[PDB]
């Protein structure tokens, strides 16, 4: 059987592969800014139970678990992702606390996966907080045997804090990191004013942030990037001249290199440029880097100003490099260029939905607990008739039937709100003193112990009942009014900002406009 | 010639076969399960560089394929007149298949015009219900098999004109219902799902109802009331009547209140005229003309009366999916060699595929352009 | 069972109830009453189980951990059968 | 011992070998991965032992000298005879190291 | 002397030091923690044949 087929299968398979790569591989989401690989790794670490206050664990076990259950797509990619998350100089806020050879700026690769020991950090628990409370949806695995959360109930916009750099089949994205405090301030300002302008958001957040400090010069580029979504920005290293008190000689000091710059390759390129006579005013080159900070020493040639040589270096050396800002992500599974305000609004809506679902879950749980406790207290009220009913019934099923069928006296010592004390599925034919039992209630009564008959359990049950009443009342109040929910969100954001505050690292010196505008319009 | 190529005993071309799979993962079991008479396998390593993105007559890494099949020009040496390309069912398999196809297209058009390139179709699903086994290769075939298992001689007992509703009519009804639910799930990207699911049981609507306001008011009131009744989550439903016309042109408007922002959904003449709404109305009328309130269906030794058709369908699917087993092969180096021989390269059981040279279009020109790759994704 | 019921209902503290159970002897009814030996652990002191009978802190804790389902006309025969089976097993 | 602690009996579904290899490397045998995988493949080959112990499924090589597939494709589990080797272990029958 | 051995700034012998450890596992951290004045580390590959 050889059926004749058309060549269109080529284009069909190409479109299928392109769609698959764009949807599930490259482009992250806007609600959490996390790749599916990072998602699976974090979920595996959460299921394994490796907290920050616990001992270290071998990375090979975690890699094997991830390959076996959720990510069966090799081992090199997962290990490289773990190493990237473990490098402090690669992310503004690390997530995986490890110990071992994790590489450095020299370009040296990390050790094998049988030597390092990794574990979760304190901030990582804030990303997947309140997950078991039915806050998100579950997605089946490759063979339909496990569940994967769709999104994580996060509290920090990791897309804006750290960002990512991925490329699709036809698309590409690149987002600079930022500071957490200014993002929280902007979110609070947006909660205050829904109609805030772009100028207000720019005033709240001057510019991006980097794990290594630098000098930002272009402001129109970042302005266009925040306004439209595309733009270019220049990065300049920090350096200065040195003149001794005596005759001495001039010396250039390099305190820091730009973002994603190899130091050994840079030194090799500088040596090659000095050898090729392309650069002048450089005699030799030394190094004084240690565990107290990177320090590069360059000896200035005698009878040289050094400023012209420094400008020639800035023009030629990689110390001055541009940056391809491009904000592209998925909004409903489709690539859409989104600005800052849209991301903030999506984050606020996601947080509102997560809080609402968690509140509904907690309310249902408290309702069930209170409904069980009511029957337990009714059983504790009258005990002797239950004693005779158990002692005279040979079959426990017959005893349960007799308990359910016979009413009770509802003593005065046993006897809240007008409503909201019963589940929704409960039929009005129960709990009309008069009182009736239930098969589940009778089963819970039959599962009691002898220690619950002291002079201390009754007060504990009464206190628990009062606490459940207060809790369900507060939950009904917070579900009825949205201002209380907004205040809770504001308080949580303020608490997170207070717990995870820090200080600025980089510095922005604006000269692209001071040199241009004041010399063109005067 | 040495290393990877493993020819057969026969040397006369047009009688042997050639294959191209992953070397260490697949070729091992392929050679352990092949024949030693007219079988030949040429392993591969990773991917192959593109022709259009970097065209260079000197650029070559493997060169083994073209050197072993022809001399690279081809009319002289036509060895291995029949070639078959086995490839995994994943997305990377489709990608490497596309690269191989465009390679053989842009290198030797004559071998493709004469009908020599073939494509294999390995299975995808392995369903085993105790003794009953089944090999399924497609998603639609899997869905049809699931529907067939879920309807193993069911017999519905309602209070309609048919005392025992069963046969092919019930199967066709379930198929139409599944197709309509798929269409609703596809259109859900535009409109919410609650109203689309509720319009199944709601009465019909006609453009002649725009005269009387009482009828539209009663209809929207019943709709909002039933939506509030069925609403078990944290949401509400409100109605709205607006007149944007010369005299009436009555247009209902539904106001829903989600977590923090309200949203309206007006109804226009285009929505009523649309074919999707017409199909929904026809299905709703067909289902209301059944009187499926008191139903009794059994599959196959137990029955349970319900109040919803979709609930009974879900119960039947759950009862059919109790003790079945499904094995999905995501790679050629996963199954046994004898299973591969019997299901993929069995000359009496295989199902190959032929490629044609019908038209010469500029699809390959837009394959790598950075503009065609950006304008082509119009899947909306 | 009834004296245990009064002892639990009148004792506010469960520790005091356990102490009262351990300190007070029992009547050892006729319906309650094996081998001459090999029915007791090696670490058990001969001052317990001399009718006359005394309890133990572990025994009293196990007694306080009982449920209401063990008071049917079916649990007694099951306990007797299990005791006979344990006797046969330890003898073998 | 790792296969017994993991709980992979003969009457259960198959499991990926990479998980078992990683577990053995993490807890008990931290001496590489190649030796453990080669030992598993040797135990999985029928033509290498009179009585096999690890029932697997996949490309396990043959007499032609072809090596087995990667550790991300095969699926292994204990056999009926393997349970007789470690029978009555939790009853304090041997010493612990 | 390609790649592997990274000498120090000083060229006069009897002042520098030489080390021999495993390449990929040890030499990385060894170079990341050493000094750049009188330190030199030569990686190794597995074992060495007997004499
Ligand atoms: O494939 C090749 C080809 C050539 C080659 N040359 C040098 C070299 O170092 N390597 C070369 N290679 C590759 C790599 C060696 N390779 C062996 C397998 C190892 N596997 C890592 C691993 C995987 C798993 C582990 C542990 N370790 O436990 C959990 C389950 C999965 C990675 C390194």
Short mmCIF file of N, CA, C and O in Angstrom, two decimals, chain A residues 58 60-61 64-65 67-69 72-74 114 142, chain D residues 16 18-19 22-27 30-32 72:
data_model
loop_
_atom_site.label_atom_id
_atom_site.label_comp_id
_atom_site.label_asym_id
_atom_site.label_seq_id
_atom_site.Cartn_x
_atom_site.Cartn_y
_atom_site.Cartn_z
N UNK A 58 22.44 16.27 46.49
CA UNK A 58 23.16 16.12 45.24
C UNK A 58 22.29 16.53 44.06
O UNK A 58 21.09 16.24 44.03
N UNK A 60 22.57 15.47 40.97
CA UNK A 60 22.30 14.37 40.05
C UNK A 60 20.94 13.74 40.32
O UNK A 60 20.23 13.37 39.38
N UNK A 61 20.55 13.63 41.59
CA UNK A 61 19.24 13.10 41.93
C UNK A 61 18.13 13.96 41.35
O UNK A 61 17.17 13.45 40.76
N UNK A 64 18.02 13.62 37.52
CA UNK A 64 17.41 12.36 37.13
C UNK A 64 15.91 12.34 37.36
O UNK A 64 15.16 11.82 36.53
N UNK A 65 15.46 12.92 38.47
CA UNK A 65 14.02 12.99 38.74
C UNK A 65 13.31 13.83 37.68
O UNK A 65 12.24 13.44 37.19
N UNK A 67 14.30 14.45 34.61
CA UNK A 67 14.32 13.73 33.34
C UNK A 67 13.29 12.60 33.36
O UNK A 67 12.63 12.33 32.35
N UNK A 68 13.13 11.93 34.50
CA UNK A 68 12.24 10.79 34.56
C UNK A 68 10.77 11.17 34.52
O UNK A 68 9.98 10.54 33.82
N UNK A 69 10.39 12.21 35.26
CA UNK A 69 8.97 12.53 35.37
C UNK A 69 8.50 13.61 34.41
O UNK A 69 7.50 13.40 33.71
N UNK A 72 11.77 14.93 29.95
CA UNK A 72 12.61 13.90 29.31
C UNK A 72 13.20 14.37 27.98
O UNK A 72 12.92 13.82 26.91
N UNK A 73 14.02 15.41 28.05
CA UNK A 73 14.62 16.02 26.86
C UNK A 73 16.11 16.24 27.07
O UNK A 73 16.65 17.32 26.81
N UNK A 74 16.79 15.21 27.56
CA UNK A 74 18.23 15.30 27.76
C UNK A 74 18.60 15.66 29.18
O UNK A 74 17.76 15.79 30.08
N UNK A 114 28.22 15.43 39.75
CA UNK A 114 28.41 14.52 40.88
C UNK A 114 29.23 15.16 42.00
O UNK A 114 29.64 14.46 42.93
N UNK A 142 3.48 14.05 29.77
CA UNK A 142 3.58 13.55 28.40
C UNK A 142 2.74 12.30 28.18
O UNK A 142 2.22 12.09 27.08
N UNK D 16 11.81 4.49 34.46
CA UNK D 16 13.00 4.93 33.75
C UNK D 16 14.26 4.56 34.53
O UNK D 16 14.30 4.68 35.76
N UNK D 18 17.15 6.11 34.34
CA UNK D 18 17.90 7.29 34.76
C UNK D 18 17.61 7.65 36.21
O UNK D 18 18.51 8.05 36.95
N UNK D 19 16.35 7.50 36.63
CA UNK D 19 15.99 7.78 38.02
C UNK D 19 16.74 6.86 38.97
O UNK D 19 17.29 7.31 39.99
N UNK D 22 20.47 7.76 39.07
CA UNK D 22 20.68 8.96 39.85
C UNK D 22 20.53 8.72 41.34
O UNK D 22 21.30 9.25 42.15
N UNK D 23 19.53 7.91 41.72
CA UNK D 23 19.34 7.60 43.13
C UNK D 23 20.53 6.83 43.70
O UNK D 23 21.00 7.13 44.81
N UNK D 24 21.03 5.84 42.95
CA UNK D 24 22.17 5.06 43.42
C UNK D 24 23.40 5.94 43.54
O UNK D 24 24.18 5.82 44.50
N UNK D 25 23.61 6.84 42.57
CA UNK D 25 24.75 7.74 42.65
C UNK D 25 24.61 8.69 43.84
O UNK D 25 25.59 9.01 44.52
N UNK D 26 23.38 9.14 44.11
CA UNK D 26 23.19 10.12 45.17
C UNK D 26 23.35 9.53 46.56
O UNK D 26 23.96 10.15 47.43
N UNK D 27 22.80 8.34 46.80
CA UNK D 27 22.79 7.80 48.15
C UNK D 27 23.92 6.81 48.43
O UNK D 27 24.62 6.97 49.43
N UNK D 30 28.38 6.67 44.90
CA UNK D 30 28.82 7.89 44.20
C UNK D 30 30.18 7.72 43.53
O UNK D 30 31.17 8.36 43.90
N UNK D 31 30.24 6.83 42.54
CA UNK D 31 31.48 6.51 41.83
C UNK D 31 31.24 6.51 40.33
O UNK D 31 31.64 5.60 39.61
N UNK D 32 30.57 7.55 39.84
CA UNK D 32 30.31 7.67 38.42
C UNK D 32 28.95 7.14 38.02
O UNK D 32 28.12 6.73 38.85
N UNK D 72 18.12 7.15 28.76
CA UNK D 72 16.87 7.90 28.75
C UNK D 72 15.81 7.23 27.87
O UNK D 72 14.78 7.85 27.59
#
